[PDB]
């Protein structure tokens, strides 16, 4: 059973701007998602300092980068706090609405897309390189859910029946046909070494066989 929701008008405009604006420095998407993963690991680690049982779903705190040339997907996995159903449908957008509005005003005030993280909506930079994004997420207080959007103004949410994650978030980028350089090992290493050198968790790049 799948539920289809419309994006809030502000987020829907930001997504259509990110897809249709010809911006060359597309590599910043990886920094934004790695930074989001780092935040999510901070929250579960902090919660566990007063409640060690919060880690029963998984003690490891890491970020995995998994390119797949055959599927043309780049997957960013983290074992962070994860996201609830309410997060995917309401709470993340409600927190963002002000940053999304402010980000559009800044884009006319001399700012470029690369400052998207300063407004808390960096996740949507995924659509610089991806035609479709799938998010698998698992929060200690909720079930495993699958979020998906190809932009176009709507997204879907469903209960995920696949491989249980335990805890964390998996972002699956279905890359555009002209953005396959981000499936290359030496390219990913360059972006990590240039944009995410100071992340307080291990970032493991999975090499394809």
Ligand X SMILES: Cc1noc(-c2ccccc2)c1CO
- CA 156 from centroid of its chain's CA atoms: 16
Q: Please report whether residue 127 would count as binding ligand X according to CB under 6 A.
A: no
Please, which of residues 139-198 interact with ligand X by CB under 6 A? 147
- 25 annotated as a binding-site residue: no
Q: Please report whether residue 41 would count as binding ligand X according to CB under 6 A.
A: no
Comparison of 67 and 82: residue with beta carbon closer to ligand X? 82
Q: Please report whether residue 93 would count as binding ligand X according to CB under 6 A.
A: yes
**Ramachandran angles phi, psi of 138, nearest 5°:** -145, 120
**Cα gap 64→76, rounded to integer Å:** 6
- Per CB under 6 A, the list member of 96, 113, 116, 173 interacting with ligand X is 96
Closest CA to 130 of 178, 192, 191: 178
The least distance separating ligand X from the CB of residue 6, rounded to whole angstroms, comes to: 14
Comparison of 56 and 143: residue with beta carbon closer to ligand X? 143
Closest CA to 80 of 193, 165, 172: 165
**Cα gap 191→80, rounded to integer Å:** 22
Comparison of 111 and 187: residue with beta carbon closer to ligand X? 111
Q: Output the six-digit token pair for 195.
A: 């944009």
Residues that bind ligand X (CB under 6 A): 36, 88, 92-93, 96, 120-123, 135, 147
């Amino acid at each position: 059973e799948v539920e289809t929701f419309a994006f809030q008008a502000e987020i829907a405009q930001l997504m259509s701007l990110i897809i249709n604006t010809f911006y060359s420095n597309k590599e910043i998407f990886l920094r934004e998602l790695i930074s989001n993963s780092s935040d999510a690991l901070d929250k579960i680690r902090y919660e566990s300092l007063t409640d060690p049982s919060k880690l029963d779903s998984g003690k490891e705190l890491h970020i995995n980068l998994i390119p797949n040339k055959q599927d043309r997907t780049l997957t960013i996995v983290d074992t962070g706090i994860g996201m609830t159903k309410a997060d995917l449908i309401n709470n993340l957008g409600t927190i963002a609405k002000s940053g999304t509005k402010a980000f559009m005003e800044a884009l006319q005030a001399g700012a470029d897309i690369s400052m998207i993280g300063q407004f808390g909506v960096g996740f949507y930079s995924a659509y610089l390189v991806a035609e479709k994004v799938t998010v698998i997420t698992k929060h200690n207080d909720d079930e495993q859910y699958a979020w998906e959007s190809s932009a176009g103004g709507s997204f879907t949410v469903r209960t995920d029946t696949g491989e249980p994650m335990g805890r964390g978030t998996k972002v699956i980028l279905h890359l555009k046909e002209d953005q396959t350089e981000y499936l290359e090992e030496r390219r990913i290493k360059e972006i990590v070494k240039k944009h995410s050198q100071f992340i307080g968790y291990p970032i493991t790049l999975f090499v394809e066989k």
